[PDB]
Design a protein around this ligand. Structure first.
Ligand SMILES: NC(=O)C1=CN([C@@H]2O[C@H](COP(=O)(O)OP(=O)(O)OC[C@H]3O[C@@H](n4cnc5c(N)ncnc54)[C@H](OP(=O)(O)O)[C@@H]3O)[C@@H](O)[C@H]2O)C=CC1
Ligand SMILES: CCCCCCCCCCCCCC(=O)SCCNC(=O)CCNC(=O)[C@@H](O)C(C)(C)COP(=O)(O)O
Ligand code: SF4
Ligand code: SF4
Ligand code: SF4
Lengths: 53, 287, 176, 80, 156, 114, 208
């Protein structure tokens, strides 16, 4: 949170574990196949709303 | 006139524009594009249908929130038609099946339908009534189609005389009839000179004429830019498309210009050629 | 404090290694999974017959957006604009006028059912409990025109019932 | 069959083939940029158009240094 | 008028055959997808209504647009809509999807899915409760009960 | 006053990079108009490309020219891939009116647009 | 003062004060502010040249480990010539403490692309480039991620308004989806909530 002396926040921002987990997908899946990639997307819990910020 | 019929601000997406249009038809081709360009203009369209609401459903979201409105009509009673044209600024008449049915001929749709709607219109007090017609529909032979359209032309000219009787040539587009029959072939080869006019210049002309007053009373006719042979056009269609009785007689019948009545140039719209839009629309061939 | 996993070894004793070989070549715990799933087969399944049996709820559900009124009296709303001041998608639209009597009232009280996220802030913000989140949740509306409530629609929807709303509030006017 | 005059003739008819040039009006000292009313946009159009016509890549600084028909012909005579 | 009698009976049979199973495709962008999977749950059934949840777009009877439609989403959404058989119906689920909703005043968001595909059944809520969504599918079935296609074809 | 520019020293390197970027856009157009199964002649597309270049010719500040070159390179990458669809490429064009001219009296009929 | 008001520890305040004084003394080349709030979370305010040297110091040295990287944002503050604020956030695995490395920057001059020492900063830097336009020289790949491709404007600025300039709709004219200038259906009303009367006397700035 970034707050002016105010009732409105000046700037909020969210550190998202979904975004951080999706960030390393190439190095997590350099040596496998596509169903294993779907299992990689599964094995890090995803909502795809929080990954957006 | 009352407020909320005057224009307001810019155009598009429920900006309150001028005309409130009662449209007969609009489930077909040209009426659907006309509702599309009035929705781009931002005009309220009252359309009655007679069919299943699924057709008016897949042409429903053209307008903004609650702009266009759907109701019912029938080809028999004046009460439903009059209820549909109780409060209307402008009204357009587009109707017609190109084959006779069990309950309708080429007669009495083109004859009986403009009679009752023009009756309740002239008793109603509508303005800028635009009635379509096929080009060169005569008293002459070869088509119950064309002669019943000529009778309807004489009717709309005689009663309610300040109607814009409008006619394009045989139009081509995304859902053309005759270019589809050119695709749905087999064959035969004849000669006829012919000018094709693309659909969006036609409907742009119709919306410009219906929103621009002082251009009333005069019948209009739309002109194709090329005007060459039919069989050369069929060779052009097969070349661009990569592959080597009533409709065929009514395309071989008559295609001429008339120096009496004014066309595109008194409206100020650019004409799109056959070649550009034909290359745009001739998809769905082999790869 | 931590309690981690996967710290063992396959036991080199003959019985344990031939048991792992028996599971490998005899398909055992797969059939154990089949037995567990057949045990859930022989249960009675927990379904509800939907059009006849409706699923249970709470006395504080947030549904219909109905209005209330006074006992044999007039409209409960004052048009004090608190609900439009708190409405986090601004779906409330209030234009207020007083009538010929003198008490301050409205002209236009519109709820957009599209924008309504169903918080409950307009219920908590109402000082006189004029707007109340309703009990029933069946809108299912075939046209987008019909999903924009007017104040008269809200009054008809508050006069189709109060006894449900009054029973829920009279049960739970003590928590909130 | 690769002389200076054959390259100049093929450069000549592709200058004929370019549309906005009015007329061709070839000269060894033509300078079609300012003496014929053209843009540096049209300069780089013609330079990479010759690149599209008959060969080597013609990079940016040598694309800048030409500004002239016969100097293009002589630069190709240097490079080809 | 046994011609009309056969038309009415055959129309009843074919429309009951349409509204009987109605397997959808779950498009399901945001948390409305989670509530759709909660009406896929063992309490609120879908087996009873012939309704099979299925990701296949090629055989989609109805389509439940749910979640939050964006500008980046919309051409791919209508491309999903195109490769679909012409008897088709649309349930717009969710305040986000049936008119913009809580993200109505924003950029990158189409103001409801009315501006892309036509909508038969709007069901509002955030999330629209699985009970209420199942009610909306019942009123969709009653819309299928009133369609009169073969009546219009016979007296056309 | 210390300002660190991106690439530029004078506008010579600016001219050099923008003419190379225009060469890249020229050899970019026909492959894309063939790949996306588009509906526009190549002449019209190239003329709208060079019209978009000629829109911002009024900038002499070299950092701004560098940032324009970097933006154009970004969108040339994203259109030389298949990452951008038919919608964005048509969105560069304007075939849906948008009819608004700059006449005084035309803006006086459909008013309140000074 | 004691019930329902959160008490604090002056011990952690003294620890962070001494630590920030230590870091300020031993990297004098770029330290401008070392400020400590009331609830003991450290802030170090840094010139935009010592990005790589200060982060290479703060990753290591066995007195401030701070391996854990978090948020990056550049809080858009006008009424300045250096507008944007790049905020590194660092967490120590070994010491359980939070330091905020606020370096300042302007619109067009790059800071030096912290992805060289921080492998978590890659999509963070790509996000800041997409939403703001803070350029990052010596970076592998800068693209637009968390925006549309054909959209531009760098929307998390203050110059970009709430609604976008463009708005999509499908049309059957050209049989596809097109963008138009924005035609809102309602105003997005603006409540003048900035009430007077000085709710905090301690944070008064000196007027002119
Ligand atoms: N090249 C061309 O095709 C040209 C055509 N025209 C004219 O333009 C008009 C529109 O053409 P087009 O779209 O191709 O054809 P359509 O048949 O699709 O248009 C007629 C419309 O009126 C409806 N309609 C027709 N007959 C009846 C009826 N008996 N009862 C109820 N509704 C009826 C149609 O179906 P529904 O009932 O389902 O709504 C449709 O909505 C026609 O009148 C045609 O003559 C003019 C010049 C050139
Ligand atoms: C589908 C079509 C494809 C998309 C179409 C739109 C593409 C948008 C690309 C945008 C790129 C630009 O507009 S950058 C324009 C740069 N303009 C400048 O003025 C840069 C500075 N240069 C100059 O002033 C000069 O070099 C001149 C005057 C432009 C040229 O001088 P030459 O003569 O020495
Ligand atoms: S808060 Fe209650 S009384 Fe006040 S305007 Fe809203 S509904 Fe009316
Ligand atoms: S529940 Fe609906 S009407 Fe009430 S404050 Fe929330 S969005 Fe507004
Ligand atoms: S309406 Fe509510 S539950 Fe549905 S997608 Fe939007 S935020 Fe999620």
């Amino acid at each position: 949170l970034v707050s002016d002396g105010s009732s409105r926040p000046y700037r909020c921002k969210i550190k998202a574990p979904g975004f951080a987990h999706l960030a390393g997908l190439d190095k997590m899946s350099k040596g496998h196949m596509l169903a294993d990639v779907v299992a990689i997307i599964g094995t890090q819990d995803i909502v795809f709303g929080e990954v957006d910020r | 006139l009352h407020h909320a019929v005057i224009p307001h601000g810019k155009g598009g997406r429920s900006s309150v524009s001028g005309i409130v249009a009662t449209v007969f038809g609009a489930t077909g081709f040209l009426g659907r594009y006309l509702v599309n360009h009035l929705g781009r203009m931002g005009s309220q369209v009252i359309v009655p249908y007679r069919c299943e609401p699924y057709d008016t459903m897949h042409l429903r979201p053209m307008g903004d929130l609650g702009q266009i409105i759907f109701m019912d009509w029938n080809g028999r009673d004046k009460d439903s038609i009059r209820r549909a044209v109780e409060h209307s600024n402008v009204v357009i008449n587009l109707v017609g099946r190109e084959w006779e049915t069990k309950n309708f001929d080429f007669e009495d749709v083109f004859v009986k339908i403009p009679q009752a709607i023009a009756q309740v219109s002239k008793e109603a007090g509508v303005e800028k009534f635009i009635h379509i017609s096929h080009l060169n529909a005569d008293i002459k032979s070869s088509s119950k189609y064309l002669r019943n359209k000529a009778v309807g032309e004489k009717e709309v000219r005689e009663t309610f005389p300040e109607a814009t009787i409008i006619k394009p040539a045989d139009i081509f587009g995304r859902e053309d009839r005759f270019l589809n029959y050119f695709a749905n072939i087999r064959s035969l080869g004849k000669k006829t000179v012919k000018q094709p006019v693309y659909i969006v210049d036609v409907t742009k002309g119709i919306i410009n004429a219906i929103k621009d007053p002082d251009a009333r009373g005069k019948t209009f006719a739309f002109v194709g830019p090329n005007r060459y042979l039919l069989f050369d056009l069929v060779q052009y269609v097969f070349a661009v498309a990569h592959r080597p009785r009533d409709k065929v007689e009514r395309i071989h019948t008559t295609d001429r210009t008339l120096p009496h009545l004014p066309g595109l140039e008194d409206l100020g719209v650019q004409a799109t050629p056959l070649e550009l839009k034909a290359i745009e629309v001739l998809r769905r061939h082999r790869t | 404090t931590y309690k981690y996993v996967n710290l063992r070894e396959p036991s080199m004793d003959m019985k344990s290694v031939t048991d792992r070989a028996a599971q490998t070549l005899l398909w055992t715990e797969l059939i154990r999974g089949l037995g567990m799933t057949l045990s859930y087969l022989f249960r009675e399944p927990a379904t509800i017959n939907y059009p006849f049996e409706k699923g249970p709820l709470s006395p504080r559900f947030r549904g219909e957006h109905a209005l209330r009124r006074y006992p044999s009296g007039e409209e409960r709303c004052i048009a004090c604009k608190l609900c439009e001041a708190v409405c986090p998608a601004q779906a409330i639209t209030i234009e207020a006028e007083p009538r010929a009597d003198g008490s301050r009232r409205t002209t236009r009280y519109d709820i957009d059912m599209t924008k309504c996220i169903y918080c409950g802030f307009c219920q908590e913000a109402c000082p006189v409990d004029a707007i109340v989140e309703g009990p029933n949740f069946e809108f299912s509306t075939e046209t987008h025109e019909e999903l924009l409530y007017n104040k008269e629609k809200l009054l008809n929807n508050g006069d189709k019932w109060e006894a449900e709303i009054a029973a829920n509030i009279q049960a739970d006017y003590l928590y909130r | 069959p690769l002389t200076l005059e054959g390259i100049k003739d093929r450069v000549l008819y592709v200058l004929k083939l370019y549309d906005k040039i009015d007329p061709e009006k070839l000269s060894v000292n033509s300078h079609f940029m300012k003496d014929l009313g053209l843009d540096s946009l049209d300069q780089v159009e013609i330079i990479m158009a010759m690149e599209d016509e008959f060969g080597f890549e013609i990079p940016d600084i040598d694309a800048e240094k030409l500004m002239c028909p016969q100097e293009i012909v002589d630069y190709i005579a240097d490079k080809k | 008028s046994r011609g009309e009698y056969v038309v009415a009976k055959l129309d009843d049979l074919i429309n009951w055959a349409r509204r009987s199973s109605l397997w959808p495709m779950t498009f399901g962008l945001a948390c409305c997808a989670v509530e759709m999977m909660h009406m896929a749950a063992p309490r609120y059934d879908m087996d009873r209504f012939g309704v099979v949840f299925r990701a296949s777009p090629r055989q989609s009877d109805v389509m439940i647009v749910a979640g939050t439609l964006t500008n980046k989403m919309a051409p791919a959404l209508r491309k999903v809509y195109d490769q679909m058989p012409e008897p088709r119906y649309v349930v717009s689920m969710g305040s986000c999807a049936n008119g913009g909703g809580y993200y109505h005043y924003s950029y990158s968001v189409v103001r409801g899915c009315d501006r892309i595909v036509p909508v038969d059944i709007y069901v509002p809520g955030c999330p629209p409760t699985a009970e209420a969504l199942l009610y909306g599918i019942l009123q969709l079935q009653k819309k299928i009960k009133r369609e009169k296609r073969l009546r219009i074809w016979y007296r056309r | 006053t210390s300002v660190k520019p991106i690439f530029s020293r004078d506008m010579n390197e600016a001219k050099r990079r923008v003419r190379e970027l225009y060469r890249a856009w020229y050899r970019e157009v026909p492959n894309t108009v063939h790949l996306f199964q588009l509906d526009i002649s190549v002449k019209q597309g190239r003329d709208k490309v060079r019209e978009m270049f000629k829109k911002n010719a009024h900038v002499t500040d070299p950092r701004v020219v560098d940032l324009l070159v970097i933006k154009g390179k970004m969108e040339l990458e994203e259109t030389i891939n298949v990452w951008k669809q038919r919608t964005h490429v048509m969105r560069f064009f304007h075939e849906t009116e948008a009819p608004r001219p700059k006449d005084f009296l035309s803006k006086f009929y459909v008013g309140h647009d000074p | 003062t004691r019930p329902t008001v959160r008490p604090r520890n002056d011990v952690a305040h003294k620890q962070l004060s001494a630590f920030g004084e230590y870091v300020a003394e031993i990297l004098p080349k770029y330290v401008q502010q070392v400020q400590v709030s009331c609830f003991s979370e450290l802030e170090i305010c840094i010139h935009p040249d010592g990005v790589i040297p200060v982060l290479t110091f703060l990753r290591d040295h066995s007195n401030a480990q701070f391996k854990s990287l978090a948020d990056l944002t550049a809080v858009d503050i006008p009424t300045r010539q250096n507008r944007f604020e790049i905020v590194y956030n660092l967490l120590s695995l070994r010491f359980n403490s939070r330091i905020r490395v606020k370096t300042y920057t302007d619109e067009l001059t790059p800071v030096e692309s912290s992805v060289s020492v921080y492998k978590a900063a890659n999509w963070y830097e790509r996000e800041i480039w997409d939403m703001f336009g803070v350029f990052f020289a010596n970076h592998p790949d800068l693209r637009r991620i968390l925006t549309d491709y054909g959209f531009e404007g760098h929307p998390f600025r203050k110059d970009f308004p709430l609604s976008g300039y463009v708005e999509l709709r499908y049309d059957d004219e050209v049989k596809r989806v097109v963008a138009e200038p924005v035609e809102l259906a309602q105003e997005f009303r603006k409540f003048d909530l900035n009430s007077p009367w000085e709710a905090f006397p301690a944070y008064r700035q000196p007027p002119e």
